[PDB]
Design a protein around this nucleic acid. Structure first.
Lengths: 129, 101, 25, 217, 83, 132, 221, 71
RNA sequence: GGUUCGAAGACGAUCAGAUACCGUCGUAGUUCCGACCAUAAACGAUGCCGACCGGCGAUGCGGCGGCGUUAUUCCCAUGACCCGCCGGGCAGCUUCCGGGAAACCAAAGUCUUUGGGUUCCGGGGGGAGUAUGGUUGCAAAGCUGAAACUUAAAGGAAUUGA
């Protein structure tokens, strides 16, 4: 059974980048995955996309720019600290020049560069470099 | 170490198959694994298709063929040279030898 | 020594001992 | 290539493609070529599209106009169908043909004295002319190929759809290209119908020389 | 490719595929460069200029070499629209 | 086991190729035509060469010899390369067209051709041959 | 004592024209000559031998021995080789592995751990390189660390230019051939790892066959 | 790791213990049989009354009588 | 209940010796109805449920669309032959998707670019599936199951030879 959605979708786009489609349809859709998607299309690692409201759950048709080596997820969503985020990034993004770790805070789903400005830890969702 | 893909026998929907007695030996062999042949043969082959036709009764006659179905175990096959060993790609050719004459 | 004919041999010199250790009861 | 009724397909180029039998394709089909196919017959023959013949006859003849030296063009047929279609072609654009038997390690090998180094490969059939193209890897070689619905597309950079096995069909596609490159340079007019005849580029069978030398008287 | 002071430090900018956005490596031979000629709109002759492109080694033997030049051609007005 | 080494046939095709005129069928005469011009340091080797010559000179009288060109049938080879017919094979009036090839050309501007003898495909769509 | 260049790109070089083999690298054109590389880098280039290995092939009367020269090279500034050759004596084997390396040189990238003020000093991201069953990995690292690794893939990098770097490893390292092959390939994978400093598009220039086309019709066939 | 849950923590931890008893340089460690056998009992040196001098042969390729004692 | 075959046995040949092959007989057994026993290379030597990533030629079951022969003659639709469309099934072929130690695998793929959920299990060779105790059976045996001692190699896939 489809026990956990995100990670259906996140491999899918990666597996449509290795191969290289002009765009990718990803099946049952949520308010965490569309959310995640907008965080990516806020730093340019994909382009603009369309969601398709069929009265069930949506489908989404992203358009994939070839600036995307790999997307991935972490599972389960561990509980992080402000003292314990160096030693993810320092073992989960490739370089000290690029990379991003999406997590979920009370003040929103966002990237690790911003949760150090708002000074808020919380959970963890996946990464993208 | 693996050499054949389909391991000596045609069987992919079954688990168990029925056994058959090698007609040179009398060994049990799995139906599918066997080497089979079919023989059709007039009771006159080449030499004796001459003596009978001039000292026979009926004006325009035809003699009967003789129909057998053989079944070989692997080493019964190989000894009697119905079949060879073969090289590694060569192996593959399920394309049977050409019967023109 | 083939395997199967060794596992007769463990199986024959254990069944003797089950005669032996019986008698001493 | 198009939009321009100065490069467009002419009334005088419809009854040559039909009369030879270049539109008449195959029964089998590779997955790449369904964007040059109209619709199948009740009989079992794939009709190849004719607008997409002209829009892909000029793009290829747009690269050969962009090529700087006449020499560098390596034209080929192994097969004996159109070897008078790759030599007279060389007697109009000034290419370098290699017809009949490719000596492998031609492009790839230095020490030999058959040693080639072109900048474009115009080959009459990818399937048959296999050994040409893999060499088109080890050195970098923008490739052209007169493909069909049948063949696979290994080391080619343009797919011109036509029946490329027949006697009337291979040599007719080796005159237009030479026409439509020479017209794109200004050596034959778009005005005067081109003095050369299309039968100059079909290869001669040894069965119709016994027809032609022996029946003249 | 700088420090703070804006001076270009890295020793050469490589090529990038006009089709997919994958950088064309140095020991990658099944690469390509292909110029395509332009033609005067009234004369039907060579203008003296082209429309260049490129394709990398990973895309050719994969199979999709003859449906990337037409997705780049069409869009620069070499080839007509309906096709 | 009379078969001749590559020393022979190398020096035979290289003596037929140039001097096809002087040479001929006689063994006893080209025995001199092989010796006047060339350098050949043995009388046995002289005879092997000068008679395959005669073996090879009777094969120009029937078909084209592979490892060797000559000026007589190399012009007449190219005779057929410079052939052009009088009435062309493609420029034909009464051309055949099917009811799918009629409907695909008419989608383009060529939609009322005066010389298309429009035909039909044979009814029944069986073509394939059975298996076994 | 002459250099008599056969090819079309080598005859150009021999005339002092196509300036700085970064120009050939751009165009991905395959080098199969020795002197090109000798002509651009030359005395800036330093070789070594890391291992000579013997091998045999059982025949009917004893067996045939031979020797196997893996040879390092590459200027103290951004390019390296790692060729190999096998022959029936050793200084044959050495000589003809030097040459076969110079053939396949490749130009290395390098970058900054953290902050940017001075010069570039390590593998710009986390890249991995393999051959056989040895998996080397090259992790970026802060100033004056040094090269933290084993003798083999230290004696490539040191030269390469990469000055400070943390490594990893896997597998049968004793199979030297592989290791030394496994870390080279790795550094071959610095200039093929796409960052957002290189998302700005390509603007095309001209191959050396196209610009030099009237000169080459007059100088060699 | 193979049983990835968030509240597994014991399933995970009953399995490695179980396991580590398969480890040798450890079980040899975590049972009393290693120190029951051992002459020194658990120790780096231990003194004794000699009683006869004795030559032991060596094993093959090598050969040469080796000079020992029995304490 | 006992036709054929056929462990044990009796002879005949064989060989230096054969209590092994072959050859002549023949019990337990081979077959039914009743209840025990729980293991086999019980095999694809390949966990089950889930997503995704190429091309073709067959085939079985079900549904749908479409020229034309044939059957019941009188055609309605049902059967038989003919070309596709969709769903689930057993297999193939092709290939620079990718992997691997290779053989090879469209899975054995999507793994230092290391996290979809979960169950069994291995940690150099022998000793040894042994001893012992507990367990289950009428019995043979089945499930659980150590130690002292013993040793630098067992082993895998591929090369050339002989």
């Amino acid at each position: 059974v489809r026990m956990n959605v995100l990670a259906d979708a996140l491999k899918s786009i990666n597996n449509a980048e290795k191969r290289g489609k002009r765009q990718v349809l990803i099946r049952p859709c949520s308010k965490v995955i569309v959310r995640f998607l907008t965080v990516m299309m806020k730093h340019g690692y994909i382009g603009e996309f369309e969601i398709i409201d069929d009265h069930r759950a949506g489908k989404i048709v992203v358009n994939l720019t070839g600036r995307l080596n790999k997307c991935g997820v972490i599972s389960p969503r561990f509980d992080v600290q402000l003292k314990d985020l160096e030693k993810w990034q320092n073992n989960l993004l490739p370089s000290r020049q690029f990379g991003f770790i999406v997590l979920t805070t009370s003040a929103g789903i966002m990237d690790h560069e911003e949760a150090r400005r708002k000074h808020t830890g919380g959970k963890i969702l996946g990464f993208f470099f | 170490t693996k050499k054949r893909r389909n391991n000596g026998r045609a069987k992919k929907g079954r688990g168990h198959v029925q056994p058959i007695r090698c007609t040179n030996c009398a060994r049990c062999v799995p139906k599918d694994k066997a080497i089979k042949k079919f023989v059709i043969r007039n009771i006159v082959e080449a030499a004796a298709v001459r003596d009978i036709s001039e000292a026979s009764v009926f004006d325009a006659y035809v003699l009967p063929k003789l129909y057998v179905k053989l079944h070989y175990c692997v080493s019964c096959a190989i000894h009697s040279k119905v079949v060879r060993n073969r090289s590694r790609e060569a192996r593959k050719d399920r394309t049977p030898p050409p019967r023109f004459r | 020594m083939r395997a199967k004919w060794r596992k007769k041999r463990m199986r024959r010199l254990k069944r003797k001992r089950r005669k032996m250790r019986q008698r001493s009861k | 290539s198009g939009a321009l009724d100065v490069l467009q397909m002419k009334e005088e180029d419809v009854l040559k493609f039909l009369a030879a039998g270049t539109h008449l394709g195959g029964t089998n089909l590779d997955f790449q070529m369904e964007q040059y196919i109209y619709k199948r017959k009740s009989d079992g023959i794939y009709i190849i599209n004719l607008k997409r013949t002209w829009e892909k006859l000029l793009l290829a003849a747009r690269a050969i106009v962009a090529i700087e030296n006449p020499a560098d063009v390596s034209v080929i047929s192994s097969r004996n169908t159109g070897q008078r279609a790759v030599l007279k072609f060389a007697a109009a654009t000034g290419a370098t043909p290699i017809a009949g038997r490719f000596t492998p390690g031609t492009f790839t090998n230095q020490i030999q004295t058959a040693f080639r180094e072109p900048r474009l490969l115009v080959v009459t059939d990818p399937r048959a002319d296999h050994q040409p193209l893999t060499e088109a890897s080890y050195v970098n070689l923008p490739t052209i190929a007169l493909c069909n619905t049948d063949s696979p597309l290994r080391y080619v950079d343009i797919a011109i759809p036509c029946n490329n096995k027949g006697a009337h069909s291979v040599g007719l596609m080796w005159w237009m290209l030479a026409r439509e490159v020479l017209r794109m340079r200004g050596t034959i007019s778009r005005e005067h119908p081109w003095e050369v005849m299309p039968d100059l580029y079909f290869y001669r069978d040894p069965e119709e020389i016994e027809k032609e030398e022996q029946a003249a008287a | 490719m700088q420090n703070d002071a804006g001076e270009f430090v890295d020793l050469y900018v490589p090529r990038k595929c006009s089709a997919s956005n994958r950088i064309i490596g140095a020991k990658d031979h099944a690469s390509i460069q292909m110029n395509v000629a332009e033609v005067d709109k009234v004369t039907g002759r060579f203008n003296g200029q082209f429309k260049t492109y490129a394709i990398c080694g990973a895309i050719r033997r994969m199979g999709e070499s003859d449906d990337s030049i037409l997705r780049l051609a069409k869009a620069d007005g070499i080839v007509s629209k309906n096709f | 086991g009379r078969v001749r080494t590559k020393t022979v046939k190398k020096a035979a095709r290289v003596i037929i190729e140039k001097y096809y005129t002087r040479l001929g069928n006689d063994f006893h005469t080209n025995k001199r035509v092989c010796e006047e011009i060339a350098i050949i340091p043995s009388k046995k080797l002289r005879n092997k060469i000068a008679g395959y010559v005669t073996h090879l000179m009777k094969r120009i009288q029937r078909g084209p010899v592979r490892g060797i060109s000559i000026k007589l049938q190399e012009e007449e080879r190219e005779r057929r390369d410079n052939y052009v017919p009088e009435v062309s094979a493609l420029d034909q009036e009464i051309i055949e067209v099917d009811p799918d090839t009629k409907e695909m050309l008419k989608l383009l501007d060529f939609g009322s051709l005066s010389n298309l003898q429009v035909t039909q495909p044979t009814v029944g769509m069986n073509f394939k041959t059975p298996r076994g | 004592k002459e250099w008599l260049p056969v090819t079309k790109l080598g005859r150009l070089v021999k005339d002092m024209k196509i300036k700085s083999l970064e120009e050939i690298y751009l165009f991905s054109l395959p080098i199969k000559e020795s002197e090109i590389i000798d002509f651009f880098l030359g005395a800036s280039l330093k070789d070594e031998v890391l291992k000579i290995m013997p091998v045999q092939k059982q025949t009917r009367a004893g067996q045939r021995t031979r020797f196997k020269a893996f040879v390092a090279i590459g200027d103290y500034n951004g390019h390296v080789g790692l060729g190999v050759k096998c022959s029936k004596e050793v200084a044959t084997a050495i000589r003809g592995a030097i040459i076969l390396a110079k053939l396949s040189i490749v130009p290395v990238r390098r970058g900054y751990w953290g902050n940017k003020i001075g010069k570039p000093h390590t593998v710009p991201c986390k890249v991995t390189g393999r051959c056989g069953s040895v998996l080397v990995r090259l992790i970026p690292a802060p100033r004056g660390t040094g090269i933290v690794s084993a003798p083999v893939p230290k004696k490539l990098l040191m030269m390469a230019g990469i000055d400070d770097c943390y490594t990893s490893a896997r597998g049968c390292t004793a199979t030297l051939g592989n290791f030394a092959k496994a870390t080279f390939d790795a550094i071959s994978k610095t200039y093929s790892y796409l960052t957002p400093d290189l998302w700005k598009e390509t603007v095309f220039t001209k191959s050396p066959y196209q610009e030099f086309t009237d000169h080459l019709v007059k100088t060699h066939t | 790791g193979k049983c990835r849950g968030l509240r597994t923590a014991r399933k995970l931890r009953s399995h490695r213990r179980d396991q580590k008893w398969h480890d040798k340089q450890y079980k040899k460690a975590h049972l009393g049989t290693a120190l029951k056998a051992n002459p020194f009992g658990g120790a780096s040196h231990a003194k004794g009354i000699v009683l006869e001098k004795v030559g032991v042969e060596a094993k093959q390729p090598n050969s040469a009588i080796r000079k020992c004692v029995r304490v």
